[model samples]
Target chain A: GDDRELAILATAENLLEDRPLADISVDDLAKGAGISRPTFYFYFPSKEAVLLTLLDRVVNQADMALQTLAENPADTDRENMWRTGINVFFETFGSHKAVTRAGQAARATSVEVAELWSTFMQKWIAYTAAVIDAERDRGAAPRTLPAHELATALNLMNERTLFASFAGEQPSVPEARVLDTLVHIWVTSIYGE
Target chain B: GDDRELAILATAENLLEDRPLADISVDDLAKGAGISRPTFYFYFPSKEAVLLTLLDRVVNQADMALQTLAENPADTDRENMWRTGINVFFETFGSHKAVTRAGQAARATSVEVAELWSTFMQKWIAYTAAVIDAERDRGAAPRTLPAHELATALNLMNERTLFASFAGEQPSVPEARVLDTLVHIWVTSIYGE
Candidate 1:
């Protein structure tokens, strides 16, 4: 793989932590990547695309934990396996906290990034929902909540819960309990036992 | 009660749904309220304060459900009483949805409003946590989760869930299931039964 794209992504992530995405122009990104400003568009369609690509990296590696589970059918049991995926998701957000936070802030203020992030959320929901339906089909989990509905709720909960932790927002759970509380809620919310 | 302060608040709410708070000038607020622009300072320290006051209305009337429960203590049954408060909180947000949404958007984009909303969340968490502690104190609910942590998590869930519905954001639960899922999650999360 060519390393120039990696350079561009790294530059955006560093700039995101320093300031708002809106404040960092294309030239700023291209210059930091050791490329000319006009050449930046060849690699990415827009600056938002750079951040969107950065977001893609986070979700994929995080979500891969679940995919790894899906590919291997033998159960490590749902709770612990689910915990693994959930733990990876949290660690991914914590590691990419600043870049993710910028994308979230932009999602709130700008229509474009909001849609981008929204699309990202739906893919996540669908993937998780598929796992839910599969588990129910095999009689591992109950069907009390609709697969999509529960998936959406839990994922939304995950997003909301993680973001508040990252921002140190009040009305927050203690750091120690955050993932445990979320994991417990998901199991009970889905299995209802 | 005085009416002019009411005039200022109403104007702010009406304007909030139309535009960003930063876009709505203090002059615009005062003129809408039929006062001189400079006189706007008499009622509120700043325009952000105007929005903060409006937010107070939403929290108080909505939270009145819990307050009423706490004062009487007849035990409408913890589950039913909680459902009542949760329902009221939802209805209150729906009725004030646009204005509340504005505050949320501002919170994401502006530091001042972000802190303003943070303070509002703390007051809410305290109120709800008090009720949880009261219920647990009397042995009506389990002590599995700490009152403050559960209160903060559930309230954060409520805010995130409701805001997405208002914004029509995806990864959303069905409107019908929103209150039910949230209510169930709170019960299982705190009571753990």
Candidate 2:
């Protein structure tokens, strides 16, 4: 992914760290990516198109992490398995903090980005629900709420908590505590321990 | 509070249910309130000022609810106190879902609205920490992490989860399930039940 289009995506992601997506105009993105305005339009119709592309990359990475965690469950310590999955989720976002921040900020304002973000979240929710269902079948997880709804709420909690922590939009909290708190909630909510 | 300024706020809140903040212009706001554009300008500086005023009302309602819950803790059942507080929170937001939606959407693009939203959240976080600290003193809550950090994460989870569920931004989950799931997380994280 080192072609001209890829270069444009990288430049946009870097610029998003300093300013919002709306603030970065086509001229700015084209200039930063060493391409003319016409070439920029040729590759992508709008600035949001570029952001959607970058968001897709981040979502794909996160999807892979969740997939791996789901495939290999811990037979002995279920809590540790959940903790490892949480770590992978956080690490993936940590690696792509800039884009994650941009995607989150854009989700409220941009219709396309919000839909894309929702799509990605739905995928995670489904995977989580499957895991919870399997645990329940083995008489491990609780059955207070349906697996899908439980997974939806838990995943939303993780998404919002991680986004705020990484974006520095909220009060300063140690990173380790944030991760532990989330994992604890996930474990207790599922296992009711 | 049936004065012209308050009337304008009420009208804006009603309009927000049908449309987003960005879509509601100053002209439309003034017209809806049966006032001229000049009078609207005299009362509030901009459209966001109206939103900020409305948001403050919702935040104040939420603050009152939490304060009441903190003052009257269930000595024997700490988790019940948490459930009551969460109910108050969801009720406050439910009563003013239109403005809550507008405030959340405007938070992404407008600096003033974002700062206002942060201010309100910080107040909630501080109040939550105080309650957690009190519970820890009584040996009812865990001390795995500092009270403030734990409160911050849990509060973020509540804010984001509520916002998504109310705004119809995620998959359709029942309102009751969302509230119960959040209360469960808060109780489990703090009390380790």
Candidate 3:
């Protein structure tokens, strides 16, 4: 079974809630996982490695949520469908705020983490772009820019907006309002509503 | 003359061009400034403080650029006025890529930097909101969300998008394209152009 490996990740995630990854040492992680320090290395090379694995889990969950949007593009209620798709993204990101925040902070330092995060964003952009293209073909979305570029901007907007609202102390805007603000942007940008 | 203090800040900014703030040591900073480690303390408390000072300069410059927008809000060439305002932002941000990048990365770890950056963002949001409110009053902008909320989202998008393109490895979109995309969002979201 993968119980021991799962324990290591779970321990790191819990520790992240209290402190950043830089402050949490391998010894602390090993102790929490009930393993020796040397054995911790056997599971993951470094603390960043553990973080990368944790980041992978979060990305996978988000990928699944995004896939729901792609599979049912022809839904009769387009507005509700778009709303559900965005809510899924917000909920998934909110569920793992600690990891995502840690990942954001760690990205500037670790090439592996940065590349992983970039790859995940590219996948999301591609998915969103396809939806925009489909909408444009049906005369529903704007054709001023390429679908991919428009999708990239909108997705990056959501990424940055959510990170600022959830991870930082700047906005002070309510979570519901933040969600509505983002949804409104997406709807208007795509549907010109 | 406070020249030594100026040298320290300048040295830190130059050093940041090569490496991250975390990788830099106080000893290196002092040496770069041709002063002893203790002397470095005489000028500034920590490396982050030096960054805060640099950030202050950049923010002041941005504030001046933003003022151009407010002073001539009634410019008949609305599109060019908006384009020029957004370009001023991009150019100023581009000029100080190293310090801004370091400042962004530092925000998460340093409480002082975080507070300073948050205060600066609030100032920008207030300024942009006033412009949006004026536009709505004149029937020039949309009446979708509150002016402040719309301003917050657009400002945050520009922030995240610029940081992504300039600091990080994602998107790899050209500078002109990125600026155009952002300008488009601002124009459509506000003026419904």
Candidate 4:
């Protein structure tokens, strides 16, 4: 049953490469999975359940990376570690832009999805803040603003910055240039340097 | 007829003060105005039209405030002006949280409202960016990050911050502390200082 379900989920992801997840339907998923509609329903409560499953899978990977960072704080290179974390997230979701779009649309349409995203973002901010606080306590970085505020600012900044990229708005600087600008802002604001 | 129309709109506003605008109906508005249901259709096409009218009124006020800033470049008191402008906005919408929430919900539910909000936010960002750029040019503020990024950051920060506040999740920081924290971040990021 698990293997069959994974196969179905994999098929959904493949379809998302061409179109957003929200645009696909249960029938499409069932047909693609070579199963009947009832069979599909037996495995998943809703299309969103599949999406949540995918998100959980990806978030687990990030959590593991953080666990490794925490265990080896001394060996942790802050810049490299932060970059890798962000890169992994973007790369995973970036390839599935449709899923992200679908998730956003779903959040707007469904209270459940809205709460799900809000909870996800809050935990992500808290986690990032904890890491920054630990680094500051160790004197590896200058501590200025509290980690919570810094984390909130960074979390919000990344969303707006990436949304700009998603919309294809022309910038005087490159995309990496924008990311660099945001990181610089975080450093200056949080470190007071 | 105009007086009756005004009465209906006023009644709608009052109802919105008590509950989310999305929950209010033409019957409720008509009853509040002491008019018949059909009378509402005589003055407005739909409840949506009334919302669009209210949004326009607010946008006009914002535009006026922005115009004053543009007209007096020599009086570029960034901190004071921004504080006043944003306060006006917050105070105006804050008293009518239900209405604002309804509007956001409508944007998600209705394609028309979504387009309207997107256009308004774009203009809002553009106008704010101009002010920031002018301040930098006049040496009233340092030029650090690109004007557009800073503008988007501030705009989004204000919006998300207020939403969090309305949701009662914002930390127990004093209003001044919140303002100071935001300004510090903006200046440091933009000036690289």
- Which candidate number has the best DockQ? 2
Off by over 4 Å in 3: B23-38
Q: Relative to the unseen true structure, what is the C-alpha lDDT of residue A81 in candidate 2, on a scale of 0 to 100?
A: 81
- Give one digit per residue, the lDDT tens place, for model 1 in B1-193: 2588999998888888778787899899999999987678877888878877787677677667557755765556656767777787678888887678877776765677677667767877898888778878888667766677767777788888877877677767766678777777776666664
Q: Model 1 - which docking category?
A: medium
lDDT measured at residue B57 in model 1 versus the true structure, 0 to 100: 79
Residue-by-residue lDDT tens digits, candidate 4, A45-148? 98888776665565566556556655765444455566555554555555555555556656555666666667766877788788778878888757666677
Q: Rank by DockQ, descending? A: 2, 1, 3, 4
List the candidate numbers ranked by lDDT, top first.
Answer: 3, 2, 1, 4
Q: What order do you get sorting by TM-score, best first?
A: 2, 3, 1, 4
- After superposition of all CA atoms, the RMSD between model 2 and the true structure is 2.3
Which portions of model 4 miss their true places by more than 4 Å? Answer: A11-23, A61-85, A109-111, A135-145, A167-178, B14-22, B69-88, B139-143, B169-178
Let me know the TM-score candidate 4 reaches against the reference structure. 0.79
Q: Provide the TM-score for each candidate, comma-separated.
A: 0.84, 0.92, 0.90, 0.79
Stronger candidate by lDDT (2 vs 4)? 2
| Chain A TM-score across all models, in listed order | 0.80, 0.90, 0.92, 0.77
lDDT of 1 at B13: 85
lDDT of each: 0.77, 0.81, 0.81, 0.65
Residue lDDT tens for model 1, A1-193:
2577899999999998888887999999999999998788889998888887887777677677557756775467776767776787788888898777887876755676777677868978898888888889999876676788777777877888888887777657766788877777777666764
Candidate 2: fraction of native contacts reproduced: 0.69
